[PDB]
């Protein structure tokens, strides 16, 4: 589909969640509700990835924080790739402030994937995440939520 | 339908900042212009770069303003985009317009103009707070020169200067 | 439109052929049966190309080998380009084994200036075949050699065409 079209820009996905307020209220009522990014390829004939969010958090984060995760998906070129998936990911929640005025301050966490888990192995025929990515008090700060949308940024470090 | 066409709009990104827009059926189109003014041609919306600015190019085959009946008129617009809140405003990147001379580099000369976008110009500021152009980009006489028209088609080129990337030194 | 999006990743096309077993068997049933790549561009607003394979061979490779070809196609930006199309081409049948090292099957060639299909498209230059059909290898890999390693994995093959950005 157009899923195959979606390729990260230098390994980067920017995923936009709109209707944040309505969604938050849903997460609050239903702590299991998950928001999914579009699948993207890291690079051109690379790994398929997807990004996910819990607006009202989950696990330890739950009810207090936003929770961000990523997983591998079965992809067309999987047989050409190194397994497991070993490339570092950086999550950013973007502060939507005009970058002209100041360096905008993003909330960012990065992980190196752990080969000691099955999460990042070759899919067949989730992921890794942060339960306490940002707290609701911090999220209300600055411009993390603006015009009722948030930006989730996923950067995969490329050879 | 119109919907996928919109999602295809999101996939429209510049090639290192460059949009090439092809107008074909030129003689016919020019004619239809003269009959029906003021007739604006629209390029597809494109993003200067990925998660960049959305811009649209415009042309009047039969001119606009100071150009009508004598010139091709070229303009560019800033459009509301999905990632505007991540961007610098007003829009401040060099734009070069070219009309392309369709000769093989076996060496060609296009008609080109550049501007630094004007901060006062209202369209270049953040959407939510009128194309800037050249009314007289090309003379109907000069267009017929060289290869500006070939096989009934013309190429409008918009090159936006992209933000250079800051690296550590190393 | 749907097509004009087909680039061109540093000039690189990877074409995946599914249902290999069924397709190979179909090709046996009809000789001269051609498999076509999606059209692709060397670079954006560049040269338009297409790759094609014969599962059961063409010409001297008929019934014995996979046969691989590339042609120039008429493109929307042809008047902005140099002709004849003179870029180096690499053909690879990918060995689909994890780097943990692939024995890819690869050939590269420089085009000839007198290759008719590689001259500017849209002008008849002798027949339909000189104008429209491409160049390649009638015996890229044999039917036996392909069953080796992971040239086939999960009933698919990977063909890779790399155009050398100069």
Curated annotation (Swiss-Prot), chain A:
Annotated compartments: Cytoplasm; Nucleus; Cytoplasm, Perinuclear region; Cell junction, Tight junction
S-S bridge residues: none
Tissue-wise expression: Expressed in epithelial cells of thymus, dendritic cells of lymph node, and in the basal cell layer of epithelia such as epidermis, nasopharynx, respiratory tract, salivary gland, and esophagus.
Swiss-Prot/TrEMBL induction comment: Up-regulated by bacterial lipopolysaccharides (LPS) and by single-stranded CpG oligodeoxynucleotide.
Boundaries of every MATH domain copy: 10-156
TM helices/strands, residue ranges: none
Description of post-translational modifications: Polyubiquitinated, leading to its proteasomal degradation.
Note on domains (UniProt): The coiled coil domain mediates homo- and hetero-oligomerization. The MATH/TRAF domain binds to receptor cytoplasmic domains.
Family: Belongs to the TNF receptor-associated factor family. B subfamily.
Protein role: Adapter protein with E3 ligase activity that is involved in many diverse biological processes including cell proliferation, migration, differentiation, DNA repair, platelet activation or apoptosis. Promotes EGFR-mediated signaling by facilitating the dimerization of EGFR and downstream AKT activation thereby promoting cell proliferation. Ubiquitinates SMURF2 through 'Lys-48'-linked ubiquitin chain leading to SMURF2 degradation through the proteasome and subsequently osteogenic differentiation.
Quaternary state and interactors: Homotrimer. Interacts with LTBR/TNFRSF3, NGFR/TNFRSF16, RPS6KB1 and TGFB1I1. Interacts with SMURF1. Interacts (via TRAF domain) with MAP3K4 (via kinase domain). Interacts with NCF1, TICAM1, IRAK1 and TRAF6, and is probably part of a complex containing TRAF4, NCF1, TICAM1, IRAK1 and TRAF6. Interacts (via MATH domain) with GP6 and GP1BB. Interacts with EGFR (via C-terminal region); this interaction promotes the formation of EGFR asymmetric dimers. Interacts with PKM; this interaction promotes PKM kinase activity.
Annotated protein name in UniProt: TNF receptor-associated factor 4
Complete-protein stretch covered: 298 to 465 of 470
């Amino acid at each position: 589909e157009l899923e195959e079209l979606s390729v990260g820009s230098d390994g980067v996905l920017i995923w936009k969640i709109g209707s944040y307020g309505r969604r938050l209220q849903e997460a609050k009522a239903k702590p299991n509700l998950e928001c999914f990014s579009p699948a993207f390829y890291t690079h051109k004939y690379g790994y398929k990835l997807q990004v996910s969010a819990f607006l009202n958090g989950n696990g330890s984060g739950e009810g207090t924080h936003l929770s961000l995760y990523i997983r591998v998906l079965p992809g067309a070129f999987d047989n050409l790739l190194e397994w497991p998936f070993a490339r570092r990911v950086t999550f950013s929640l973007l502060d939507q402030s005009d970058p002209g005025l100041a360096k905008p301050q993003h909330v960012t966490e990065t992980f190196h994937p752990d080969p000691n888990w099955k999460n990042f192995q070759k899919p067949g025929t989730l992921g890794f995440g942060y339960p306490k990515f940002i707290s609701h008090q911090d999220i209300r700060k600055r411009n993390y939520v603006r015009d009722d949308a948030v930006f989730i940024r996923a950067a995969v470090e490329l050879p």
